[PDB]
Amino acid sequence: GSHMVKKLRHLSDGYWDSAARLGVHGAVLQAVPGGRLSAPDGRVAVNMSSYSYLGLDESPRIIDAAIAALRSNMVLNSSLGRVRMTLPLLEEAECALGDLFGADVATLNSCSAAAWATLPVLASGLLTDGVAPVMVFDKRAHFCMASLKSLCADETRVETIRHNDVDALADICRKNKRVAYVCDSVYSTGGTLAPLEELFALQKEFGLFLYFDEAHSTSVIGDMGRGYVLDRMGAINDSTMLITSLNKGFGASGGAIVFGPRDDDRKRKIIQRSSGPLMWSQRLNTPALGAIIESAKLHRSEALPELQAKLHSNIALFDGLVRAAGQGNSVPIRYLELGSEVDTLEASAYLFDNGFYVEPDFFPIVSRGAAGLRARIRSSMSTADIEQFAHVWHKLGV
Amino acid sequence: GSHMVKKLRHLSDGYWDSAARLGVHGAVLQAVPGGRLSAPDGRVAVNMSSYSYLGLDESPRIIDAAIAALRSNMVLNSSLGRVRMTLPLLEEAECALGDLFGADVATLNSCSAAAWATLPVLASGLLTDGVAPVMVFDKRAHFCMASLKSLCADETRVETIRHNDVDALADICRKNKRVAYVCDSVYSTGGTLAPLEELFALQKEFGLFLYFDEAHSTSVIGDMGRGYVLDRMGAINDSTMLITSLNKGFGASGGAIVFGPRDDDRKRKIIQRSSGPLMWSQRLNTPALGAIIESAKLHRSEALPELQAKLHSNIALFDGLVRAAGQGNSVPIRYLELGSEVDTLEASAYLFDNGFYVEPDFFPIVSRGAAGLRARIRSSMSTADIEQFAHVWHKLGV
Ligand SMILES: Cc1ncc(COP(=O)(O)O)c(CN[C@@H](CCC(=O)O)C(=O)O)c1O
Ligand SMILES: Cc1ncc(COP(=O)(O)O)c(C=O)c1O
């Protein structure tokens, strides 16, 4: 009911229309070996924004395992609800993830479905000894969690703090009995991570329940690829829950809920018996589950340390050549902030035309005037790939 | 409007724990040809509650096409949001669905994701010319839609009418400018159907936006399996939107949105640019997409009229032997009501020891004291499987 808002919707559709007109959005492109993309005219670009940080999207062992699972089981999924029955492949997949993370792990269609199934239940208090907690959302929490604040609000009090405002979180932890912090482990489209040491300290003093989105941490950091939180925490406690994706880094499909300690079946029961995607939404298909089992084996092999070393070496190379948000960290997300959406779109079109695709984030993905290009470092990037990108990038000024 | 977590679970958990203790829930069973289930004991039972209505989860053409799609792409999926780019396999799949339904159709990883991506946007008025409509939910609309009422309540007024209370709906239409009705085309429980003629009449008179869930309507009902709504409407219009899942009946994986007319990209653009699962939640992997393309080809061929006829034949054979709720309906869902939650778990455990699994519905899945056995007729069932089951159902002495 505002003219100031329809003025924004018109400015909005113009940028979206420009991104399609410029070919940086809506392109139909074929996957090509080397983290590259092929257009119908034959021209191939290097994907600077692929979220397969370990290059496991091109792993022949994962692909063959997915094919073998479909051939042996001769079915795509199950023909009944999960609460009813499970295929043996599913239990092998979750047992493998449980061995890897060292916790009780369930599979879902997506990390989004994991949030839909967990966040409203954590807010109800059934996961916090019958005490409904104060759900504290970080401002930069991914919208698969932030869009569900209203669901959490119907159950308890929902507060949103500024990005990594640890001070404010303590005030809520002091003034309130039970509190939960809903955040991302690492923050994409930004060079920021979660304050694990401060958050852990608040957890020891006030019993703060910690809800992390490990989507851009799984496989990237830590032994066995367990991620950023489990590399600092060591072993999961009864007050820390993780959700993540398995299509990025892990090299598979779907998402997962890391409930907590593997000896406690209570959190899994409560969420499974709750009205959510874990009860009513379909399970991962036989190809995906076969991929998860193979990728889990590779995470226990000597290959994962090698893939992580090549990634962090590639990050070091990039940071030594291009100045981006997060320069110095060990996360594979590097955001090139340009402010203007016109500059961001024009830069993506220049790079894409010169052999490098970098995804453009504007007004709906990021705040207005905070536009920029989201580069993502992968282990499957060659040295020449990064060195050549920096060359093309610096030919624009900035 | 809301859909809050059930806090009192002593009665519920006793029923869940009993179901798992008696093996009717939480069992690890292998899929076997003929719509059958293998156990660690080696015991084989017929699945009487399988959602694969046309038996397409055992079609070798669909499985081969899923394997072929993965062998030729050598990646499970692309590594970017579908806004940035898509594989040609995804465009071929959504074009294939578009030809079948005769509408603009997008795919997601589940029907639940399709609901998350549409209902909040429909409640904002962006789909109805900027006028926020009154969101009118049916009481027995599936919970993947009903759980998001709080999201819709942030954008407009939400109300829930009694099941198929068309007179109460018509009253809501007279009192407001724009109204939208959210429901299922076919309801699993009760054997009821959406009152299409009253709804189409209200759509003509008031402009009632219609939002159908077709998870149990696609494939099983209508010419070319286009569903119950499209078979009566013929050609979709500007004020009708469908969501459905493609793993039950359709024989594939994931879900879909049927936006509206196929020559109109306005609805797709609005939703694709909204902050929802269609933007940020992973696309279907290449096996699922290959399955959708093949399944779409089958639905256009003379194999769908066959499978629909073998289903209606098997439905009639079942209705002549076993007296169940819905007897006489053309929907392949039947309720063997037993009232006692305890006796429902006993019947399911007895039938499953004798070779016929029927999933037990108890509280909270169904109202207390209204427990039943939910059977699903499939075209993959043999006349022997149906008559042999009717024998075991009467030897039980129900
Ligand atoms: C931090 C975070 N959490 C959750 C999700 C959702 O996980 P799903 O398993 O895909 O539901 C994403 C996806 N953000 C991706 C987009 C993913 C895609 O659409 O392919 C990104 O923008 O890199 C994410 O970046
Ligand atoms: C009527 C109905 N709608 C929606 C869904 C959602 O299914 P899915 O999220 O697995 O695609 C289902 C699942 O039970 C359903 O039966």
Side-chain angles (χ1 to χ4, degrees):
Chain A
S2 167
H3 164 71
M4 185 184 173
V5 178
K6 307 312 116 192
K7 175 80 173 182
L8 292 183
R9 160 146 175 83
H10 175 80
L11 207 68
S12 125
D13 300 324
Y15 299 145
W16 280 114
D17 287 347
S18 296
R21 166 172 57 258
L22 285 157
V24 298
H25 277 183
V28 182
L29 302 170
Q30 179 67 271
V32 152
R36 287 156 209 265
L37 310 169
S38 178
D41 68 347
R43 304 219 289 178
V44 168
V46 170
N47 192 346
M48 304 297 299
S49 298
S50 159
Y51 52 53
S52 186
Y53 312 113
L54 294 189
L56 293 178
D57 61 335
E58 307 178 31
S59 172
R61 308 293 78 189
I62 296 183
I63 297 295
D64 292 354
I67 299 174
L70 196 47
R71 286 188 175 274
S72 55
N73 285 277
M74 286 294 183
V75 72
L76 270 174
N77 60 344
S78 64
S79 57
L80 276 165
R82 181 199 181 104
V83 289
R84 312 298 189 178
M85 277 163 17
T86 56
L87 208 59
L89 192 69
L90 201 162
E91 302 300 332
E92 184 184 0
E94 302 193 346
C95 195
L97 290 178
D99 300 333
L100 199 66
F101 289 98
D104 197 17
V105 182
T107 60
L108 289 89
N109 312 125
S110 55
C111 186
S112 317
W116 189 356
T118 53
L119 283 169
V121 190
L122 178 61
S124 72
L126 303 181
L127 270 50
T128 45
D129 292 301
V131 177
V134 173
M135 299 285 288
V136 174
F137 288 74
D138 189 294
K139 173 78 173 185
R140 305 262 199 93
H142 188 268
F143 209 48
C144 78
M145 305 145 90
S147 61
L148 306 176
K149 288 177 185 173
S150 305
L151 261 44
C152 300
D154 291 0
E155 301 282 352
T156 183
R157 169 191 173 191
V158 172
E159 287 288 352
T160 314
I161 67 175
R162 304 179 308 178
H163 193 20
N164 294 333
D165 192 356
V166 181
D167 304 334
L169 183 55
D171 183 46
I172 314 173
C173 291
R174 299 185 192 101
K175 199 257 180 295
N176 272 103
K177 176 181 179 179
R178 211 77 157 84
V179 181
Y181 183 47
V182 174
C183 75
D184 303 9
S185 299
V186 316
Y187 292 89
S188 40
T189 309
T192 325
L193 295 80
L196 286 195
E197 310 301 337
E198 298 87 326
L199 291 173
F200 290 168
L202 293 180
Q203 177 179 69
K204 305 202 68 176
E205 187 177 0
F206 304 101
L208 176 62
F209 198 103
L210 295 174
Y211 190 104
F212 290 98
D213 194 323
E214 210 74 12
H216 306 277
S217 322
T218 300
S219 303
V220 174
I221 190 61
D223 296 3
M224 317 274 284
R226 295 165 69 247
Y228 178 44
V229 179
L230 298 180
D231 194 61
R232 286 288 190 170
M233 185 176 291
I236 194 159
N237 60 38
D238 58 353
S239 297
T240 300
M241 194 158 57
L242 311 181
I243 65 171
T244 190
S245 298
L246 304 178
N247 57 332
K248 344 177 188 301
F250 199 74
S253 297
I257 307 167
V258 183
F259 297 105
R262 203 170 180 180
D263 50 11
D264 203 25
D265 59 13
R266 303 195 302 267
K267 283 197 185 65
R268 176 190 286 266
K269 287 173 181 168
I270 297 168
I271 298 167
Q272 240 164 19
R273 297 168 181 182
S274 292
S275 195
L278 193 53
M279 170 190 286
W280 69 52
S281 192
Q282 49 185 289
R283 303 279 83 253
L284 285 175
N285 59 23
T286 309
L289 295 165
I292 299 177
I293 303 175
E294 179 67 38
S295 178
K297 297 177 185 179
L298 302 182
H299 278 68
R300 313 192 77 182
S301 71
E302 57 274 56
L304 179 92
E306 302 175 15
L307 299 170
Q308 293 185 354
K310 176 57 181 172
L311 173 62
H312 292 99
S313 174
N314 283 346
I315 296 177
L317 181 60
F318 181 94
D319 279 345
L321 301 172
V322 181
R323 180 199 195 275
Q327 185 175 13
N329 69 36
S330 297
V331 332
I333 312 280
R334 292 292 178 268
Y335 191 55
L336 307 158
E337 190 149 357
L338 308 178
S340 160
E341 294 78 11
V342 182
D343 288 346
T344 299
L345 289 178
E346 208 67 34
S348 186
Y350 166 82
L351 295 165
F352 196 25
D353 200 6
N354 289 282
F356 296 92
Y357 182 84
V358 198
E359 55 187 336
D361 291 351
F362 17 105
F363 59 93
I365 315 169
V366 77
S367 186
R368 308 219 317 103
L373 298 176
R374 202 202 313 183
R376 318 210 217 198
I377 313 301
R378 345 174 302 262
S379 75
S380 54
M381 293 179 155
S382 80
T383 276
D385 289 326
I386 294 160
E387 287 171 342
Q388 179 67 18
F389 164 76
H391 175 81
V392 181
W393 169 246
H394 295 304
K395 291 166 56 181
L396 231 43
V398 186
Chain B
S2 57
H3 184 87
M4 274 158 304
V5 178
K6 157 191 285 305
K7 311 283 191 307
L8 313 172
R9 300 189 166 180
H10 179 272
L11 182 68
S12 308
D13 288 354
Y15 289 150
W16 289 117
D17 286 324
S18 299
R21 183 184 67 248
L22 274 64
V24 296
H25 273 203
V28 176
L29 263 53
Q30 178 61 51
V32 159
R36 286 172 160 76
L37 307 163
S38 174
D41 308 23
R43 198 185 327 165
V44 169
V46 173
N47 190 4
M48 302 294 302
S49 304
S50 159
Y51 292 82
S52 195
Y53 294 122
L54 296 186
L56 295 177
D57 64 336
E58 289 178 355
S59 176
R61 304 234 321 281
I62 293 184
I63 282 147
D64 282 334
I67 301 175
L70 186 48
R71 281 228 61 94
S72 66
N73 288 260
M74 293 306 298
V75 294
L76 276 167
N77 208 4
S78 63
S79 297
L80 291 168
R82 71 175 294 154
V83 156
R84 322 296 194 183
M85 55 138 291
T86 35
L87 294 169
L89 194 62
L90 190 146
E91 297 305 322
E92 190 180 350
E94 301 194 352
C95 172
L97 290 175
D99 301 327
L100 177 63
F101 296 115
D104 193 20
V105 177
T107 55
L108 297 90
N109 55 47
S110 69
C111 182
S112 305
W116 189 355
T118 53
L119 287 170
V121 188
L122 169 56
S124 73
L126 290 175
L127 311 185
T128 54
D129 298 303
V131 174
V134 173
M135 298 291 296
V136 178
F137 286 77
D138 189 285
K139 167 68 73 174
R140 287 149 65 167
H142 192 273
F143 279 2
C144 80
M145 297 169 298
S147 51
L148 308 169
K149 291 178 183 180
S150 323
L151 262 49
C152 300
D154 291 353
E155 299 276 2
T156 180
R157 190 212 306 176
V158 181
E159 289 171 10
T160 308
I161 64 176
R162 279 163 294 175
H163 183 72
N164 292 10
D165 197 353
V166 296
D167 298 341
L169 180 58
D171 189 67
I172 301 177
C173 292
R174 309 186 188 105
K175 313 290 184 58
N176 306 263
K177 291 193 63 177
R178 272 283 213 174
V179 179
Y181 178 57
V182 182
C183 64
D184 304 18
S185 306
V186 167
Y187 301 86
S188 317
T189 60
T192 39
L193 250 54
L196 290 195
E197 295 293 359
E198 287 87 3
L199 292 181
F200 291 149
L202 283 179
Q203 185 180 52
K204 207 183 73 178
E205 187 168 3
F206 297 94
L208 178 65
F209 197 99
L210 294 176
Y211 183 100
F212 299 101
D213 186 333
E214 287 244 328
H216 302 281
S217 167
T218 298
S219 305
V220 42
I221 302 181
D223 187 33
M224 278 167 292
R226 294 172 66 249
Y228 174 57
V229 172
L230 298 181
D231 195 60
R232 297 299 171 84
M233 177 166 44
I236 193 165
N237 57 30
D238 286 76
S239 293
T240 301
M241 171 176 309
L242 317 179
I243 70 172
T244 182
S245 58
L246 308 165
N247 65 330
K248 53 189 69 182
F250 198 75
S253 298
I257 304 170
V258 180
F259 301 106
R262 196 178 181 179
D263 296 351
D264 192 357
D265 65 349
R266 282 190 276 112
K267 274 178 175 63
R268 178 191 286 259
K269 285 167 75 167
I270 293 172
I271 295 178
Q272 185 63 79
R273 296 164 178 187
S274 296
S275 216
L278 193 57
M279 172 181 294
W280 67 52
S281 199
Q282 54 183 279
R283 308 139 311 286
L284 284 167
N285 58 22
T286 43
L289 291 172
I292 296 178
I293 301 176
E294 189 67 15
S295 175
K297 285 172 184 166
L298 272 92
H299 282 56
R300 289 196 127 196
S301 74
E302 64 275 354
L304 174 134
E306 290 191 34
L307 292 166
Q308 279 189 344
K310 176 73 175 153
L311 169 66
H312 296 140
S313 158
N314 279 19
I315 286 178
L317 175 69
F318 185 90
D319 282 8
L321 273 58
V322 173
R323 281 64 161 172
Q327 204 195 46
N329 298 8
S330 191
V331 300
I333 308 177
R334 298 288 177 256
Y335 254 98
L336 279 304
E337 269 184 326
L338 301 176
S340 172
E341 287 84 347
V342 184
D343 292 335
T344 292
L345 299 185
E346 295 290 342
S348 182
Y350 174 76
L351 298 170
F352 191 44
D353 284 337
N354 294 342
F356 292 94
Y357 179 88
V358 191
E359 60 183 340
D361 279 10
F362 50 83
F363 185 78
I365 310 154
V366 71
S367 171
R368 194 205 193 280
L373 292 180
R374 191 168 45 174
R376 300 182 204 279
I377 308 304
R378 332 156 317 197
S379 68
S380 57
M381 286 175 173
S382 71
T383 44
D385 292 311
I386 304 179
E387 297 189 326
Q388 171 70 18
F389 164 80
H391 184 72
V392 188
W393 176 243
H394 309 336
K395 178 165 54 61
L396 172 64
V398 47

